[PDB]
Write a protein that holds these residues in place. Structure first.
Motif, PDB file in Angstrom:
ATOM      1  N   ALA A  45      13.688   4.229 -18.271  1.00  0.00           N
ATOM      2  CA  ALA A  45      12.384   4.159 -19.294  1.00  0.00           C
ATOM      3  C   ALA A  45      11.630   5.013 -19.303  1.00  0.00           C
ATOM      4  CB  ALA A  45      12.171   2.946 -19.163  1.00  0.00           C
ATOM      5  N   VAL A  46      11.372   5.549 -17.949  1.00  0.00           N
ATOM      6  CA  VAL A  46      10.089   6.696 -17.711  1.00  0.00           C
ATOM      7  C   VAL A  46      10.328   8.101 -18.554  1.00  0.00           C
ATOM      8  CG1 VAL A  46       9.052   5.650 -15.875  1.00  0.00           C
ATOM      9  CG2 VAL A  46      11.065   7.369 -15.573  1.00  0.00           C
ATOM     10  N   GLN A  47      11.663   8.295 -18.704  1.00  0.00           N
ATOM     11  CA  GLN A  47      12.411   9.455 -19.326  1.00  0.00           C
ATOM     12  C   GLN A  47      11.947   9.410 -20.787  1.00  0.00           C
ATOM     13  OE1 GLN A  47      12.590  12.106 -17.158  1.00  0.00           O
ATOM     14  NE2 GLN A  47      13.921  11.235 -15.487  1.00  0.00           N
TER      15      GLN A  47
ATOM     16  N   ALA B 269       4.769   0.463 -21.411  1.00  0.00           N
ATOM     17  CA  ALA B 269       3.459  -0.039 -22.011  1.00  0.00           C
ATOM     18  C   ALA B 269       2.838  -0.338 -20.767  1.00  0.00           C
ATOM     19  CB  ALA B 269       3.756  -1.004 -22.893  1.00  0.00           C
ATOM     20  N   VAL B 270       1.535   0.196 -20.738  1.00  0.00           N
ATOM     21  CA  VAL B 270       0.574  -0.235 -19.677  1.00  0.00           C
ATOM     22  C   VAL B 270      -0.694  -0.817 -20.387  1.00  0.00           C
ATOM     23  CG1 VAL B 270      -0.858   0.503 -17.629  1.00  0.00           C
ATOM     24  CG2 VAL B 270       1.270   1.746 -18.122  1.00  0.00           C
ATOM     25  N   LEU B 271      -0.881  -2.107 -19.783  1.00  0.00           N
ATOM     26  CA  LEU B 271      -1.915  -3.042 -20.337  1.00  0.00           C
ATOM     27  C   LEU B 271      -3.279  -2.438 -19.235  1.00  0.00           C
ATOM     28  CD1 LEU B 271      -3.003  -5.037 -22.052  1.00  0.00           C
ATOM     29  CD2 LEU B 271      -1.997  -6.608 -20.613  1.00  0.00           C
TER      30      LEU B 271
ATOM     31  N   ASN C  70       0.786  -0.997  -0.017  1.00  0.00           N
ATOM     32  CA  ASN C  70      -0.002  -0.002   0.025  1.00  0.00           C
ATOM     33  C   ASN C  70       0.895   1.214   0.037  1.00  0.00           C
ATOM     34  OD1 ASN C  70      -1.492   2.246   0.604  1.00  0.00           O
ATOM     35  ND2 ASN C  70      -2.621   1.102   1.982  1.00  0.00           N
ATOM     36  N   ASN C  71       0.942   1.948  -1.308  1.00  0.00           N
ATOM     37  CA  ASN C  71       1.601   3.347  -1.152  1.00  0.00           C
ATOM     38  C   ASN C  71       1.152   4.495  -0.888  1.00  0.00           C
ATOM     39  OD1 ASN C  71       0.332   3.696  -3.509  1.00  0.00           O
ATOM     40  ND2 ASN C  71       1.859   3.036  -4.955  1.00  0.00           N
ATOM     41  N   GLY C  72      -0.192   4.452  -0.364  1.00  0.00           N
ATOM     42  CA  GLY C  72      -0.932   5.586  -0.018  1.00  0.00           C
ATOM     43  C   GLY C  72      -1.808   5.991  -1.131  1.00  0.00           C
ATOM     44  N   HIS C  73      -1.445   5.638  -2.348  1.00  0.00           N
ATOM     45  CA  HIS C  73      -2.479   5.936  -3.564  1.00  0.00           C
ATOM     46  C   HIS C  73      -3.070   4.741  -4.115  1.00  0.00           C
ATOM     47  CE1 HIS C  73      -0.085   9.536  -3.249  1.00  0.00           C
ATOM     48  NE2 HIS C  73       1.141   8.924  -3.302  1.00  0.00           N
ATOM     49  N   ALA C  74      -2.550   3.573  -3.927  1.00  0.00           N
ATOM     50  CA  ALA C  74      -3.176   2.395  -4.411  1.00  0.00           C
ATOM     51  C   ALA C  74      -2.365   1.178  -3.928  1.00  0.00           C
ATOM     52  CB  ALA C  74      -3.093   2.131  -5.925  1.00  0.00           C
TER      53      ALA C  74
ATOM     54  N   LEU D 182       1.661   8.628 -17.630  1.00  0.00           N
ATOM     55  CA  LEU D 182       1.257   8.170 -16.166  1.00  0.00           C
ATOM     56  C   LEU D 182      -0.196   8.750 -15.720  1.00  0.00           C
ATOM     57  CD1 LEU D 182       4.604   8.399 -14.511  1.00  0.00           C
ATOM     58  CD2 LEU D 182       3.650   6.533 -15.779  1.00  0.00           C
ATOM     59  N   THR D 183      -0.901   8.328 -15.151  1.00  0.00           N
ATOM     60  CA  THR D 183      -2.082   8.909 -14.697  1.00  0.00           C
ATOM     61  C   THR D 183      -1.966   9.373 -13.209  1.00  0.00           C
ATOM     62  OG1 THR D 183      -3.364   6.797 -14.001  1.00  0.00           O
ATOM     63  CG2 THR D 183      -3.554   7.525 -16.279  1.00  0.00           C
ATOM     64  N   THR D 184      -0.728   9.220 -12.628  1.00  0.00           N
ATOM     65  CA  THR D 184      -0.541   9.955 -11.229  1.00  0.00           C
ATOM     66  C   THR D 184       0.628  10.718 -11.447  1.00  0.00           C
ATOM     67  OG1 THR D 184       0.900   7.842 -10.651  1.00  0.00           O
ATOM     68  CG2 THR D 184      -1.469   7.936 -10.099  1.00  0.00           C
ATOM     69  N   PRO D 185       1.042  11.659 -10.645  1.00  0.00           N
ATOM     70  CA  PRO D 185       2.201  12.484 -10.673  1.00  0.00           C
ATOM     71  C   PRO D 185       3.329  11.481 -10.547  1.00  0.00           C
ATOM     72  CG  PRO D 185       0.808  13.586  -9.213  1.00  0.00           C
ATOM     73  CD  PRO D 185       0.044  12.324  -9.436  1.00  0.00           C
ATOM     74  N   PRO D 186       4.468  11.580 -11.262  1.00  0.00           N
ATOM     75  CA  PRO D 186       4.932  12.785 -11.806  1.00  0.00           C
ATOM     76  C   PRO D 186       4.082  13.075 -13.307  1.00  0.00           C
ATOM     77  CG  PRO D 186       6.667  11.169 -12.336  1.00  0.00           C
ATOM     78  CD  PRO D 186       5.589  10.777 -11.390  1.00  0.00           C
ATOM     79  N   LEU D 187       3.309  12.175 -13.688  1.00  0.00           N
ATOM     80  CA  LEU D 187       2.637  12.415 -14.999  1.00  0.00           C
ATOM     81  C   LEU D 187       3.372  12.443 -16.477  1.00  0.00           C
ATOM     82  CD1 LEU D 187       0.063  15.138 -13.436  1.00  0.00           C
ATOM     83  CD2 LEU D 187      -0.415  12.784 -13.997  1.00  0.00           C
TER      84      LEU D 187
ATOM     85  N   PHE E 218       1.660  -4.477 -11.080  1.00  0.00           N
ATOM     86  CA  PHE E 218       0.279  -4.091 -11.354  1.00  0.00           C
ATOM     87  C   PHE E 218      -0.366  -3.303 -10.339  1.00  0.00           C
ATOM     88  CE2 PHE E 218      -0.903  -8.540 -10.356  1.00  0.00           C
ATOM     89  CZ  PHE E 218      -1.745  -8.407  -9.393  1.00  0.00           C
ATOM     90  N   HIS E 219      -1.715  -2.670 -10.483  1.00  0.00           N
ATOM     91  CA  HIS E 219      -2.444  -1.939  -9.395  1.00  0.00           C
ATOM     92  C   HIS E 219      -3.740  -1.457  -9.974  1.00  0.00           C
ATOM     93  CE1 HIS E 219      -0.550   1.327 -11.699  1.00  0.00           C
ATOM     94  NE2 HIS E 219      -1.868   1.995 -11.800  1.00  0.00           N
ATOM     95  N   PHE E 220      -4.631  -1.149  -9.284  1.00  0.00           N
ATOM     96  CA  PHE E 220      -5.859  -0.576  -9.582  1.00  0.00           C
ATOM     97  C   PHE E 220      -6.302   0.732  -9.333  1.00  0.00           C
ATOM     98  CE2 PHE E 220      -7.502  -5.235 -10.285  1.00  0.00           C
ATOM     99  CZ  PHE E 220      -6.579  -6.215  -9.626  1.00  0.00           C
ATOM    100  N   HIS E 221      -7.279   1.188  -9.833  1.00  0.00           N
ATOM    101  CA  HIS E 221      -8.214   2.383  -9.609  1.00  0.00           C
ATOM    102  C   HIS E 221      -9.486   2.112  -9.489  1.00  0.00           C
ATOM    103  CE1 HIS E 221      -4.450   4.749 -10.816  1.00  0.00           C
ATOM    104  NE2 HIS E 221      -4.426   3.891 -11.883  1.00  0.00           N
ATOM    105  N   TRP E 222     -10.268   2.460  -8.344  1.00  0.00           N
ATOM    106  CA  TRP E 222     -11.541   2.285  -8.137  1.00  0.00           C
ATOM    107  C   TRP E 222     -12.356   3.358  -7.508  1.00  0.00           C
ATOM    108  CZ3 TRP E 222      -7.509   0.338  -5.692  1.00  0.00           C
ATOM    109  CH2 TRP E 222      -7.272   0.634  -4.166  1.00  0.00           C
TER     110      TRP E 222
END
Ligand SMILES: CCN[C@H]1CN(CCCOC)S(=O)(=O)c2sc(S(N)(=O)=O)cc21
Ligand SMILES: [Zn+2]
Length: 257
Positions: A130-132, A138-140, A58-62, A194-199, A90-94
């Motif tokens: 890679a993030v730079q 690639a996100v599935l 649990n990282n405080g966001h998911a 990315l859908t979270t910071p740092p976006l 992997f993680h989720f948003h809900w």
């Protein structure tokens, strides 16, 4: 710090992360009528037989399920991708209710949750490099709707009590992410972020057409998690999704007619 609350939520992120207003932000609405079949796209290749899960956190966001990405064990290729991308987490948003939760929407329809399987492009050597890069991740993405239970989700659901609050983690080995896939690998794809910071604008999005079903009881357990750390005031981890962003100069391609 950033979160999903009234005072630190998506509408505020641009102040610390100005790319929040950039040219290829995610998520977006997938307008099924405007997306174009692209016959030059190849089938996805998801090779997860050798996947090695290590830990859930649990990282405080998911909550993230993390994998050993020190070798080509679980990889994604084909589709719109050139090269080999390794599964790292992997993680989720809900949502707080079944009618919301997904980040991507389809013809403005919101699903109860959205699964993100995060992979990085091996030609860049490590995840931080890679993030730079424009083609670094690639996100599935897989939609969840509420109906019948998904058996292969249950092992995830049962450990959630041991990582209730931020910063807690637990051993989580021998989990097979194949049990989270739908039957069909038909997809839409577009370049995004990315859908979270740092976006960061480093993601090739692959969103599957076919949702998986989970039970009301399964999703109910996601909503029992906490954003806060132990001994802080309790705030339920719900509605940890970013709304749809403007498509701007992008076309969404479909792998199917
Ligand atoms: C709590 C932050 N989660 C982020 C950050 N990540 C790390 C960034 C460090 O480097 C700058 S990450 O790439 O694993 C990844 S993928 C997504 S999503 N929702 O799939 O677009 C969000 C994330
Ligand atoms: Zn995500």
């Amino acid at each position: 710090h950033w979160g999903y609350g009234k005072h630190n939520g998506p509408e505020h992120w641009h102040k610390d992360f100005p790319i929040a207003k950039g040219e290829r932000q995610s998520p977006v609405d997938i307008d099924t009528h405007t997306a174009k079949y692209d016959p030059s796209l190849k089938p996805l290749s998801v090779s997860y037989d050798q996947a090695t899960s290590l830990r859930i956190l649990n990282n405080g966001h998911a909550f993230n399920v993390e994998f050993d990405d020190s070798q080509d064990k679980a990889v994604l290729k084909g589709g719109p991708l050139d090269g080999t991308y390794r599964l790292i987490q992997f993680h989720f948003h809900w949502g707080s209710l079944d009618g919301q939760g997904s980040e991507h929407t389809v013809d403005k329809k919101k699903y109860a949750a959205e699964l993100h399987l995060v992979h990085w492009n091996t030609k860049y050597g490590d995840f931080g490099k890679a993030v730079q890069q424009p083609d670094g991740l690639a996100v599935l993405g897989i939609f969840l709707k509420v109906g019948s239970a998904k058996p292969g989700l249950q092992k995830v659901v049962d450990v959630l009590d041991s990582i209730k609050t931020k910063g807690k983690s637990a051993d989580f080995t021998n989990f097979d992410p194949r049990g989270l896939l739908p039957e069909s690998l038909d997809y839409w794809t577009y370049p995004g972020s990315l859908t979270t910071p740092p976006l960061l604008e480093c993601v090739t999005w692959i969103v599957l057409k076919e949702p998986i079903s989970v039970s009301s009881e399964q999703v109910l357990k996601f909503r029992k998690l906490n954003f806060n750390g132990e001994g802080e005031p309790e705030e339920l981890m719900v509605d940890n999704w970013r709304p749809a962003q403007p498509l701007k100069n992008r076309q969404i391609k479909a792998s199917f007619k």
